[PDB]
Structure 1
Amino acid sequence: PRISRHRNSSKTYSTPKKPFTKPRLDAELKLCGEYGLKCKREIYRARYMLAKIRRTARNLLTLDENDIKRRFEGAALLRRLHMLGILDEEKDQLDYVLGLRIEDIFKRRLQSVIVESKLAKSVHHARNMIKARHISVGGQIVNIPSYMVRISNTSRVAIADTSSLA
């Protein structure tokens, strides 16, 4: 067989069960307003990634406090959530992995980082400037709007010094 038959691939979003439901059909465009979202697949994707960390946490929390699998994956899960900035330092217990939301995932996009840093007038301006290739992340130039910035790479957001803007 050609060697390409052996590559893995996978879907990254889940579509809600009841589509035509007014109350959250409204709070769903509210999110497309408070950030610059092309369509609903980027809310679906955020729900998809929150669901998995929730499922892992419930699996671990069924278990017992002195157990090895807790001692392994709880520490791993908290470390990766803290370094992505989905969870902050003061909450170092697994039971806090349950009370997150989509919004704290959205907070660490570049479009949010540069608006905290005030590098763009707004979020829609931030989007257009992202694709114009004008903002770099620590000396390397990042074309991605959905880019997820570790709080280590979060001090080094700025204009890309090769740009019409220095």
Structure 2
Amino acid sequence: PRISRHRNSSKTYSTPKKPFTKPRLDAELKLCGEYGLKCKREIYRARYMLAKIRRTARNLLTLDENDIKRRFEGAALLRRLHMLGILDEEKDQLDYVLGLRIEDIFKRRLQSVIVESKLAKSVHHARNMIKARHISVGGQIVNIPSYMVRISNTSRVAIADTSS
């Protein structure tokens, strides 16, 4: 058959089981306003990633410390988290992972990292400039607002050289 049949694909978010819940609606609108989220799918994506990390951490934590698999997977997970900036450098024990929150994920988005550097007035202004390709990471320009920057790349973010 066609080779295209063997390509993979998957969903990336989870919907709440109870849709109408006043505190949840308030919190979601609050988060959307602070971080300028386009719609409610981004929150679901963040929840999905957080759930994956939490499940991995749980499964690893259920085992003994001196287990080869536990060491291997914990080291990999901690290295990934440190590189991505979600978890602080000084934390190296697996326990700290389970207390993480989606706000930490959100704070590393491109809009946030340029706003905290004072290069933009607001998250909405940041999104407007990003869509207009006026920003660059390292030597390359990125026009995706959800692009996630790494800790070693935070100081290399600047304004696009060719931007007017």
TM over 0.5: yes
Partners of 2:56 and 2:112 in 1: CA distance: 27
Partners of 2:23 and 2:50 in 1: CA distance: 21
Gaps of 5+ in 1: none
**TM-score normalised by L of structure 1:** 0.98
Quote how far apart the aligned CAs of 1:51 are: 0.2
Partners of 1:118 and 1:69 in 2: CA distance: 44
Partners of 1:47 and 1:70 in 2: CA distance: 24
Q: Which residue of 1 aligns with 2:80?
A: 80
* RMSD of aligned alpha carbons: 0.5
Quote how far apart the aligned CAs of 1:139 are: 1.1
What whole-Å deviation, never above 9, does each CA across 1:39-92 have from its counterpart, x for those lacking one?
100000000000000000000000001001111000000000011000011111
Partners of 1:69 and 1:59 in 2: CA distance: 11
**TM-score normalised by L of structure 2:** 0.99
Quote how far apart the aligned CAs of 1:134 are: 0.2
Partners of 2:119 and 2:137 in 1: CA distance: 12
Matched residue SS, 2:38? coil
What whole-Å deviation, never above 9, does each CA across 1:85-143 have from its counterpart, x for those lacking one?
00011111101110000000001001010011111011100000011000100110001
**Aligned pair 1:154/2:162, yes or no?**
no
Matched residue SS, 1:27? helix
More helix by share: 2
What whole-Å deviation, never above 9, does each CA across 1:21-48 have from its counterpart, x for those lacking one?
1011101100000011111000000000
Partners of 1:88 and 1:56 in 2: CA distance: 18
Matched residue SS, 2:152? coil
Q: Which residue of 1 aligns with 2:45?
A: 45
Partners of 1:39 and 1:113 in 2: CA distance: 20
List 4+ stretches of structure 1 deviating above 2 A: none
Percent identity for Structure 1 against Structure 2: 100
Please list, as runs of the form range in 1=range in 2, the aligned pairs for 1:22-37 lying within 5 A after superposition.
22-37=22-37
Partners of 2:124 and 2:89 in 1: CA distance: 30
Partners of 2:128 and 2:86 in 1: CA distance: 25
